[PDB]
Amino acid sequence: AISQSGEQTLLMIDNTTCPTAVLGNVIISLGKYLGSVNYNSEGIAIGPPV
Amino acid sequence: ILHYEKLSKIGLVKGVTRKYKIKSNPLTKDIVIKMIPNVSNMSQCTGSVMENYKTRLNGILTPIKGALEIYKNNTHDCVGDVRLAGVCMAGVAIGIATAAQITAGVALYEAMKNADNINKLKSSIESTNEAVVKLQETAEKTVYVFTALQDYINTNLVPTIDKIPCKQTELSLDLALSKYLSDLLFVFGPNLQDPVSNSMTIQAISQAFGGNYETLLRTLGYATEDFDDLLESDSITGQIIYVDLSSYYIIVRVYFPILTEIQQAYIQELLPVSFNNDNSEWISIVPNFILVRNTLISNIEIGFCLITKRSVICNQDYATPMTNNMRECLTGSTEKCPRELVVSSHVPRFALSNGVLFANCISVTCQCQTTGRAISQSGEQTLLMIDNTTCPTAVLGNVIISLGKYLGSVNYNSEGIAIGPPVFTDKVDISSQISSMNQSLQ
Amino acid sequence: ILHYEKLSKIGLVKGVTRKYKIKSNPLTKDIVIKMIPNVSNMSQCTGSVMENYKTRLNGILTPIKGALEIYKNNTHDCVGDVRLAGVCMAGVAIGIATAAQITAGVALYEAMKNADNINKLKSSIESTNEAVVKLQETAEKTVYVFTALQDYINTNLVPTIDKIPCKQTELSLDLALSKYLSDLLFVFGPNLQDPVSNSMTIQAISQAFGGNYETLLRTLGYATEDFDDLLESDSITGQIIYVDLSSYYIIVRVYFPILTEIQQAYIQELLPVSFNNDNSEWISIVPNFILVRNTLISNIEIGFCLITKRSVICNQDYATPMTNNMRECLTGSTEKCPRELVVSSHVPRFALSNGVLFANCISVTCQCQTTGRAISQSGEQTLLMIDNTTCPTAVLGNVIISLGKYLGSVNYNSEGIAIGPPVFTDKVDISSQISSMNQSLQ
Amino acid sequence: ILHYEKLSKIGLVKGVTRKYKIKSNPLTKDIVIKMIPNVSNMSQCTGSVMENYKTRLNGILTPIKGALEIYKNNTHDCGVCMAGVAIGIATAAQITAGVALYEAMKNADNINKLKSSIESTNEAVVKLQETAEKTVYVFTALQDYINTNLVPTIDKIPCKQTELSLDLALSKYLSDLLFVFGPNLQDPVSNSMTIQAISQAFGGNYETLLRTLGYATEDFDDLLESDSITGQIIYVDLSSYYIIVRVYFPILTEIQQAYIQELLPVSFNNDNSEWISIVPNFILVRNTLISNIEIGFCLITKRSVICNQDYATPMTNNMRECLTGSTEKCPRELVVSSHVPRFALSNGVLFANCISVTCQCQTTGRAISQSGEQTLLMIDNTTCPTAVLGNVIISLGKYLGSVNYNSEGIAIGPPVFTDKVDISSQISSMNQSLQ
């Protein structure tokens, strides 16, 4: 299983973490990411509810 | 959880209570629509309109197959008993996709297993010359073909193939096909950016069959007594799974869900009534329909839902949040409810709930028939409750009404409440107000 | 990878390489087995054995229904909207259940929807009087009934209903029913503690039909070309989904899966050959069959799996771990390989791989044909590779063989390797070695 | 006495608890199994296969009579009094079988008094009166076959075909016999031979034998499947080719202060790998003493395990400490099969390895996360009532043990490998390490 903590909003799943993910009935092969290598280890600020 | 007495005193009288149901657990049936008619019996002097219609239909149907091939080329069966062993997704070759789009992609592959078998029938599908046809898919399975323009041809053009000049039959035909294409472009034209998804209603799909969805659904079968419901609420949806540019016929998987009533979940309707305060008439601005489920109070965007007599039916959970202040207002904190001054003379001024009558006797003349005298509202009472204790028969203009007994407080009409601040709900009023508060803040 | 060259000198000559495939994606078919014959035509002097057979049968079928009802009284459809579709489980009332038990439970409820349809046919099911009968649960869905001893009664008992004193017919019918029950008790008797499971083979299920699974599977359908495979590997399984204590018939959902080749995986078989060391014969103790998957080497408990000429087939991923020392012994480190002295005179002493033969030239007569001179093995060479380089035709005992090229080292026979320690593989020898080493440690 | 809470840490979750019952107090019944079928109705075209069958049957039967006569000629009244000088080699079981044989010789004489009646039976089950008060049944091995198929077909087909069919049927019966009554029957005196094997002298139809003998117990099926119903051969006749068998019908005696505990294995996560613990599935507890059982020989029911012998076997002391809370001594095996169980349900409380199977209960509508330190997860109504694992939606109960179950860790044992080739190499490597 790929675990999400209570600190992070979403997960970047790519071949670096593992090259094929399963989300219920879908099995998806994934490609490389072009942005930061440490995407999932850095948090950001969040806005106000509306 | 809704406190009806303060709501009524503000002017939100009780309305009907309806259950909340959603589309669920969809069965599938596969059909094909031939968007081109068979003109074989009248092909003697059809002219060149057939070829031109062929090119136009190819031009319209090419982007649909192009978008479908993005998934078709990138869908494959993952190998080995380790995982559920379903479909693998060339995600890097797909590029851009949503959750709903991917889900539809999976359902598209799933349906491919049957679509290959139906495409074995290509010659039979071409041979169809009736507006509805049933075909054997297997010794234990069947499929239906619908012809886009077979009824018109067979009923008008074939019988009238000699009584008028053939050139005239050419025009008529051309005009008929052009009318089909004009009706089609709203749905199957460039508006259809995403044919893969299955959110498209059967009513929209039937535009490819002349807008006659009742024939699609009757031929497939009235599976349940809720049929009109899954029909109006846009719960019956279909998906295009194969597009053919040689025979010009598409395969559609029609979904027939079942309506699951949500437990501990009801829809409440509130009737607004104009009420008197400070020598003027006001109407409170609150949602007409409120969704209370699991003792949780949330709004509902019912515009896309269907409001029957006993239940509220939606093809999707359309629950939306509600402001905390609105929750307090509907809980009893009645001073937080907004109110709008009414300048229209066509706003309702009285309502009837549980047989007890709420009315604004200041705005509308009230008198009681039993005692033959007027019913008086004072200047500090927002609304007047009339019931059998007051008098068993009152009138409001030209209506004689007989009232039941109230179930709440016996001294209802003698107790007042607090009233909230005025609001204005015009589109330009919101911009005007926002400027005023911003200027006030500065 | 495996180092065949270093393994060969230890005596582990290369063998056939087979692919690895496991059942996946099972299809579901439904049948009923009537565990009681229809004795209608012979009822004139059926005696009282029918009633006693009814009671004895009931004594066996009652626990099965009791174990099923632990699920039936604890299984229902949820809203399906509170969470993605599934079947609800009253787990507080179940108490003790494994993952396999719960999975069977889910399949059991899922099949219940078809089982209700089959049960709507109860009177038709009871009326069957052929060993195999075809019925409809709807016009697009067949179901099959397989009676217990209908054919046997139909073939020998009914024709001989007069030619012998039919009291003897009563005795023979009693013996036949008792024979059925004795055959049944191995599978459907008290050994069947978990009817909620899909691990029971069709061979065991056919015992309720006289062990005649070929009729079950032929009537249902040979859908795939690997059918014998799915049959021998205990891959075709079935589950009981309905037990009836009045008509004495069960409903079974038979599974027909498909064999998926586990990609990047193969099974290597190693042949043992006796070899010399210190003037005595030894045979190495290593697994005959090794499973290499995704460049990861591990054992396979191949007793349950079926071995064909081209692939290894299992009804389950029967891969088991393998010692690190076995890993190093199989990838080159022959000093960690076990060896056992051979006392028996019936151990194989030569083997042929890739057209070359590795032989133990001193323990068996070892001469060559094309020159008439004997082939000599020194006391330092464990095995002698004989190929057409030394001579193209060799003689071993009474067989004369022609040999081909070698692909590895040309100077194979001139290079020796290290040898491991002896082992003893008797059941009691393990205890003795453990005790001796324990005493040595103390 | 078992620490099930600490065992759920290692993947061993509580299963059913069963009562241990053993065969005891066996009654006796005497029957006559006639291996030669009466063929007086088919003597017109029976041919010469009958004499060949008789010779083959004599050759089969004679060693049985030989190994019975060693006890017949060495037993006399001097209770039962044995002669050990002329016996030579015998076990305790053999001596008890011999004393039982002589006790049954008293009724064997009375049954032999009806030899003419026994040899004249022409039905599958025939009733004979051995005394004024007691009776005996006679079973003929192939009489139903003859009277149903071969007798009616004596004239419609030529009797050469009848002769060949007779020879083939008798040969098939002999084929079924020889697995049991052939040279495999080295010790015919012993009574450990099951009724199912004895019924191979009657076509494997032990149901007819038992039902005619009139079982009168509610434990009958558990007795039959657990091989509790045993027999003994006490007389063999080489003139009429029949044997008389004392069928023993025992009673299931539940052992006081004895129960059998079942443990369900669950794969658990450790050091980013999935493992399974190597501890026996079934445990015998007798007066607070823990010992193994070869439950393969026994029959397991929903609330009891029935054994026709006391099958308790010793347990290693370290294993005993493992099952009593010291989980660090419980061996574990790495997991290579993608089809090992991963969740299990006890008391309505769900134990699972959420790292290997995704867990997201429906009432919170969210996933249930398992860290890299927790071997298994407990789900109950305290955390969230109804859980979903793949295709199953499951409503759960409440745990009875500690409330802080998911927050407390434990120690873990060493890895092991259970293959026979693996065992030898571990011995070899450990021996090499010692050297």
Swiss-Prot record, chain D:
Disulfide bond positions: C45-C159, C298-C307, C322-C330, C354-C359, C361-C384
Keyword Transmembrane tagged: yes
Main location: virion
Coiled-coil annotated spans: 102-130
GO biological process, any: fusion of virus membrane with host plasma membrane
Keywords, in A-Z order: Coiled coil, Disulfide bond, Fusion of virus membrane with host cell membrane, Fusion of virus membrane with host membrane, Glycoprotein, Host cell membrane, Host membrane, Membrane, Signal, Transmembrane, Transmembrane helix, Viral envelope protein, Viral penetration into host cytoplasm, Virion, Virus entry into host cell
GO cellular component: host cell plasma membrane; membrane; viral envelope; virion membrane
PTM annotation: The inactive precursor F0 is glycosylated and proteolytically cleaved into F1 and F2 to be functionally active. The cleavage is mediated by cellular proteases during the transport and maturation of the polypeptide.
Glycosylation (residues): N38, N41, N73, N381, N431
Subcellular location: Virion membrane; Host cell membrane
Region (Fusion peptide): 79-101
Extracellular topology ranges: 1-435
Membrane topology field: Single-pass type I membrane protein; Single-pass membrane protein
Family statement: Belongs to the paramyxoviruses fusion glycoprotein family.
Function: Class I viral fusion protein. Under the current model, the protein has at least 3 conformational states: pre-fusion native state, pre-hairpin intermediate state, and post-fusion hairpin state. During viral and plasma cell membrane fusion, the heptad repeat (HR) regions assume a trimer-of-hairpins structure, positioning the fusion peptide in close proximity to the C-terminal region of the ectodomain. The formation of this structure appears to drive apposition and subsequent fusion of viral and plasma cell membranes.
Record's subunit section: Homotrimer; disulfide-linked F1-F2. Interacts with the Glycoprotein G; this interaction involves both head and stalk regions of glygoprotein G. In pre-fusion state, found as a dimer of trimer.
Protein name per UniProt: Fusion glycoprotein F0
Source species: Nipah virus
Range of the intact protein held here: 27 to 468 of 546
